[PDB]
A paper describes a structure:
Unsupervised reference-free classification of ∼10,000 manually picked particles from 500 micrographs yielded 53 good quality classes representing ∼6,500 particles. The 2D analysis suggested that conformational similarity of best scoring models might improve selection of classes for 3D reconstruction. For two class sets corresponding to compact or intermediate best scoring models, 3D volumes could be built and refined. Automated docking of the MultiFoXS pools with the refined 3D volumes selected best scoring models having relatively compact conformations similar to the more compact models in the six-state MultiFoXS ensembles. The low resolution of ∼53 Å for the refined 3D volumes likely reflects conformational heterogeneity in addition to negative staining. Flexibility in the CC-Sec7 linker is the main source of conformational variability, with a secondary contribution from hinge conformers that does not appear to be strongly influenced by dimerization. Although the analyses are most consistent with an antiparallel CC topology, the resolution is not sufficient to definitively exclude parallel or mixed topologies.
Cytohesins comprise a metazoan Arf GEF family with four mammalian paralogs ([name], ARNO, and cytohesins-1/4) that function in receptor signaling, endocytic trafficking, and cell adhesion/migration (Chardin et al., 1996, Fuss et al., 2006, Hafner et al., 2006, Hickman et al., 2018, Ito et al., 2018, Kolanus et al., 1996, Li et al., 2012, Mohanan et al., 2018, Ogasawara et al., 2000, Rafiq et al., 2017). The PH domain binds phosphatidyl inositol 3,4,5-trisphosphate (PIP3) and/or phosphatidyl inositol 4,5-bisphosphate (PIP2) (Chardin et al., 1996, Kavran et al., 1998, Klarlund et al., 1997), with affinities, specificities and spatiotemporal distributions dependent on splice variation in the phosphoinositide-binding pocket (Cronin et al., 2004, Klarlund et al., 2000, Ratcliffe et al., 2018). Two autoinhibitory elements, the Sec7-PH linker and C-terminal helix/polybasic region (CtH/PBR), strongly suppress GEF activity by occluding the active site in the Sec7 domain (DiNitto et al., 2007).
Residue numbers in the entry:
A (entry chain A), B (entry chain B): 3 to 399
Write the structure that this text describes.
Amino acid sequence: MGHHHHHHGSPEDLSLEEREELLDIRRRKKELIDDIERLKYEIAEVMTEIDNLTSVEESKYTQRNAQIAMGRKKFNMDPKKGIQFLIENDLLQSSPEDVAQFLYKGEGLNKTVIGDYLGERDDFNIKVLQAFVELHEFADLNLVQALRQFLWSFRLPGEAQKIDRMMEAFASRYCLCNPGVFQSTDTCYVLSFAIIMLNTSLHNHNVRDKPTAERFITMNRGINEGGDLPEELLRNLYESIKNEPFKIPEDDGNDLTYTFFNPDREGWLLKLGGRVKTWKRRWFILTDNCLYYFEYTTDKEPRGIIPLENLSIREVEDPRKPNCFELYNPSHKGQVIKACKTEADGRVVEGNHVVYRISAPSPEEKEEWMKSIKASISRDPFYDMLATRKRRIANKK
Amino acid sequence: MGHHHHHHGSPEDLSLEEREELLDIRRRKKELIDDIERLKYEIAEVMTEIDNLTSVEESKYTQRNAQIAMGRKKFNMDPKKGIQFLIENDLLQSSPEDVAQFLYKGEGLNKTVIGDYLGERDDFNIKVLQAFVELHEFADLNLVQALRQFLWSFRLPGEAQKIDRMMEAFASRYCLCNPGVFQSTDTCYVLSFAIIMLNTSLHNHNVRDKPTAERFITMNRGINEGGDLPEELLRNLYESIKNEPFKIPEDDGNDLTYTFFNPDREGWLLKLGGRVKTWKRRWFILTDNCLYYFEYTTDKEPRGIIPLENLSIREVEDPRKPNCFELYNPSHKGQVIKACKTEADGRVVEGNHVVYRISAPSPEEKEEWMKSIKASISRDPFYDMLATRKRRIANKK
Ligand SMILES: O=P(O)(O)O[C@H]1[C@H](O)[C@@H](OP(=O)(O)O)[C@H](OP(=O)(O)O)[C@@H](OP(=O)(O)O)[C@H]1O
Ligand SMILES: O=P(O)(O)O[C@H]1[C@H](O)[C@@H](OP(=O)(O)O)[C@H](OP(=O)(O)O)[C@@H](OP(=O)(O)O)[C@H]1O
């Protein structure tokens, strides 16, 4: 420090000295706080000693640990029964909030089972799901950041209805934590699945079309209840996913986040006739789990419509045409597939196909079509869920 | 030895040693916290000294301190006027939140006056009460722990309506901080008063029936909107209160938490007739601030009903019967007490009593009855408040 002249008199107080004193006081306060923390720890230890009182002073094993361990295993076998066991035996309190804290901690818990339980339509489960999402702190996180945390805590159920409940809870929570970002919960929900599809698109090699940042901006046009979201916001989300894929717990490689494919496609194919086996070039549109085909790209009405429900694909070698596969019903051998087409006179009639043999222009287009068709068939209930949700997202005047 | 009344034993039955140690540790922690607060205050003073605006002063106390001191005294005289003085003179900002912070700090404030002010039905006061409970951090505290903090910050008003507002604010805050614990705010509210009655029961010597942990579990059956709360939860609450009574600020010994008696009782008594002074044994039920008496325990209809409104008790010596007291109206000497009874023919008529002389089977039963009756009369508006609240608690499925 050095000293000051001090001609003035004994009342002269020195700011530096006062500051130093203040610092010392602060240090003392910190020490006191540390002491308090230590005391708290001691108290906790005492409580532990008290609890499991009827025992031998030195016991080999831990009552609490043993009982909780068995309860967790019970939960993994049947979540309803596990929760019940833990509540009955006072290892867990009975409120939705306490159950949610148990699930969020998730120690020794199967995260798929967590997802199965949180996605149930029961009133208790609904309340646990709310408290569960409330344990996720979404304020000041972008949508991908929030999704990363949420998707670490459980594994998405397979049932479309269950996936919906959980993503609705997520979207509602995000919007409450980040007001003014999205115009509606519906916007947040649909954008969330856009992000999930992008994760699949960019990180699964079975997906050839790798969307650019500009492309992802264009795909989400009108999502904000008719309006567009800020380009900067969409870019940040795109770049986060591009940089790092969703990290999934207990990952089996089969997760929706990695295998959420676009079920829609358009393009030229040759198709073999039903009763009369002639090859025809047609413009095909795969949409709504149906294969629509047209004589010309300018036709308003399809030449035919093939519902894909209950069908599967097999590759075939054809004597004349390259890159062939067949659609067929594996349950109904030798039976006509339910479909409709238009005759030359304009009459709409039933198709006469036991199989639909299709030839693609290239091996690469063959693979694209088979992927799209398989994806469309395999996740239809889920794509239907999103489609019904997207309609309410789009607003008509 | 020998003492006059039957309520002084020896200290032999102690509590559990570990628990006592924990309590001591908690006390130490509290002391440390107080020390830290003092240090902080000192630091603030040092900062003020360092600061430029602070001149050397001829005066013992400074402008801010002097003005705030007078304002606090004004508040204690008339809370509305005190707040106004502090706001007008820029010693306190005008929002409910700032006023609530002033009240919560409570420096040099009468905590009874704090309670009077927070319990007012005015719109501003209602908003201050909300902000006041928001300054209490109830997350991860059990209901007793939260009650201890809340009941340190102010003294409960005497008006039933005011008590209701404050306990409603408390219960709502607790449930928001601890979601899923109680099924309703009503559950939290009624359980809170169960805890308060237990405090009186276990810690006031005028109360002979000391409920066990099992007893307290049984008393709260169906409280959770028809359902039962977890036995472990109720045990923790019971043991906390048993171990340590509610610590009340500026304690005069007259606080509700110490003098919240059960106003209800049943049992055998002899009663002296009205016009014709014959002694009859009757089964008595004290409920709803009324004394109902029956010829037989199996009777559906009472022999008579004595409203206790406006009555008081005096002990008397009787020539024939032991352990006697009289109910009488001190305002209406020599006048018949409003009551009803049934004649032998079944006609319901008015009673002819100037006084009701009652004889109890033992001195101990006499004391129990007089306590119950006095308690019932003295706090009727409040018991009525709880009763109307408990009805909405009991719901049908
Ligand atoms: O045009 P020609 O050479 O006469 O042969 C037709 C076309 O291949 C039709 O295809 P498209 O409808 O695309 O024109 C086909 O109908 P499908 O669409 O049902 O395959 C007819 O099947 P049958 O009606 O089953 O013979 C087949 O007779
Ligand atoms: O039975 P007997 O010996 O004839 O005397 C009766 C009983 O004592 C009654 O008590 P209870 O009603 O409990 O049977 C009492 O009524 P109260 O209930 O009003 O005390 C009558 O009072 P009067 O009616 O005031 O005389 C008194 O006449």
